[PDB]
Amino acid sequence: SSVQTAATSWGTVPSIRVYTANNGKITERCWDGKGWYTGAFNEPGDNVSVTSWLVGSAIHIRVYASTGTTTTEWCWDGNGWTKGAYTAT
Amino acid sequence: SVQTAATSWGTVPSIRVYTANNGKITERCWDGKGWYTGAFNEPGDNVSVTSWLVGSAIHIRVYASTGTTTTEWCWDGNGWTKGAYTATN
Amino acid sequence: SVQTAATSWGTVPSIRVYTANNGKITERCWDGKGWYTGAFNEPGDNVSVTSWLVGSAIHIRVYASTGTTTTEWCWDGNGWTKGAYTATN
Numbered sequence: 001s002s003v004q005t006a007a008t009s010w011g012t013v014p015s016i017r018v019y020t021a022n023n024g025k026i027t028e029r030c031w032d033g034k035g036w037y038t039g040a041f042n043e044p045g046d047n048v049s050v051t052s053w054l055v056g057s058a059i060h061i062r063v064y065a066s067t068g069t070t071t072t073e074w075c076w077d078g079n080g081w082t083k084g085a086y087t088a089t
Numbered sequence: 090s091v092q093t094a095a096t097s098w099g100t101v102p103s104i105r106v107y108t109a110n111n112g113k114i115t116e117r118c119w120d121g122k123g124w125y126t127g128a129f130n131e132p133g134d135n136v137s138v139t140s141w142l143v144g145s146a147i148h149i150r151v152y153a154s155t156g157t158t159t160t161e162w163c164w165d166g167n168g169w170t171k172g173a174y175t176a177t178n
Numbered sequence: 179s180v181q182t183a184a185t186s187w188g189t190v191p192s193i194r195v196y197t198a199n200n201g202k203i204t205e206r207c208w209d210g211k212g213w214y215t216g217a218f219n220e221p222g223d224n225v226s227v228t229s230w231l232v233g234s235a236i237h238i239r240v241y242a243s244t245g246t247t248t249t250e251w252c253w254d255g256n257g258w259t260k261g262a263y264t265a266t267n
């Protein structure tokens with residue numbers, strides 16, 4: 001059937017991030033006020049969810065990428081995507 | 090199964106729930122005083138949503154997908170309009 | 179694959195991740211000091227979530243769908259309870 005998307009935004013410009021899971025891969029499209037562009041996030045998954053929060057001016061994003069029963073947390077804390085501590089336990 | 094996406098704002102709060110059911114996305118709304126059916130009505134098998142305030146004014150972006158094609162819908166205070174979002178997918 | 183939904187609040191932050199797996203939705207929680215399994219447990223194939231603060235108190239709404247039926251679940255400080263949400267008129 002269809003791709004599966006997740007979205008988050010912040011500020012008043014705004015900034016938007018849209019994550020799309022498509023045939024086992026998640027990609028990211030980004031808006032920061034002046035056109036859509038392809039983001040750095042490129043990781044495996046059939047399903048995606050996202051949440052974000054600001055600490056002052058700094059955006060923090062958590063992307064939950066799932067393949068089968070395995071969910072991997074990916075963390076943006078200003079400069080790159082790092083693996084988070086999340087487990088299903 | 091049907092598929093949903095939710096957003097909220099303020100502290101009343103206002104809530105918007107989007108449901109993709111048999112190729113149509115509809116919108117249910119809470120503004121503190123009962124659920125009602127909102128103005129949003131667009132095609133899609135999958136839905137995500139994000140929203141942000143600019144002062145007291147809400148801005149909403151809904152991402153509606155069918156197959157690998159995603160269409161953005163914009164609320165900026167005066168009806169739903171098609172957004173600039175693209176994704177090759 | 180499993181289907182997830184995430185929400186977060188504050189600046190620590192607190193995070194809740196809902197996972198629909200084999201018809202059941204369960205919850206994992208972060209409050210700054212390790213992931214733990216939350217109280218939430220309801221039926222669903224698909225899940226979305228939103229949350230808002232009233233003072234320091236978190237309010238969470240989880241939209242759980244199976245077939246054509248979506249149920250709203252509410253956290254308001256006193257345990258999970260069924261919400262008034264209905265999908266259609």
Ligand SMILES: CC(=O)N[C@@H]1[C@@H](O[C@@H]2O[C@@H](C)[C@@H](O)[C@@H](O)[C@@H]2O)[C@H](O[C@@H]2O[C@H](CO)[C@H](O)[C@H](O)[C@H]2O)[C@@H](CO)O[C@H]1O
Pocket residue numbers: 055060062073075077083084085086190191208210
């Ligand atoms: C790998 C690890 O465990 N990192 C810790 C940070 O935890 C990450 O972020 C939190 C919110 C959850 O998503 C975790 O599952 C995830 O691993 C943790 O908290 C965060 O540190 C970030 C810098 O790494 C950043 O400062 C962020 O503001 C903060 O929320 C920190 C502090 O407890 O410890 C890391 O080890």
Ligand SMILES: CC(=O)N[C@@H]1[C@@H](O[C@@H]2O[C@@H](C)[C@@H](O)[C@@H](O)[C@@H]2O)[C@H](O[C@@H]2O[C@H](CO)[C@H](O)[C@H](O)[C@H]2O)[C@@H](CO)O[C@H]1O
Pocket residue numbers: 103105116118120126127128129145146147149164166167
């Ligand atoms: C039935 C209808 O169309 N009512 C209008 C309100 O529209 C609803 O809410 C908006 C945000 C969309 O989700 C619509 O599709 C939905 O029908 C509309 O919205 C108001 O937004 C305020 C904040 O900017 C505030 O949260 C308020 O609770 C909400 O009602 C208003 C104002 O644009 O017009 C009504 O006609």
Ligand SMILES: CC(=O)N[C@@H]1[C@@H](O[C@@H]2O[C@@H](C)[C@@H](O)[C@@H](O)[C@@H]2O)[C@H](O[C@@H]2O[C@H](CO)[C@H](O)[C@H](O)[C@H]2O)[C@@H](CO)O[C@H]1O
Pocket residue numbers: 194205207215216217218236253255
């Ligand atoms: C408001 C708050 O954060 N409450 C935490 C307890 O509940 C968790 O968080 C809330 C918002 C919901 O997401 C719940 O589903 C989630 O479990 C949390 O867990 C509760 O503690 C109880 C006794 O201390 C009891 O063990 C219960 O089973 C457990 O669900 C506790 C962690 O101990 O922190 C609260 O802050």
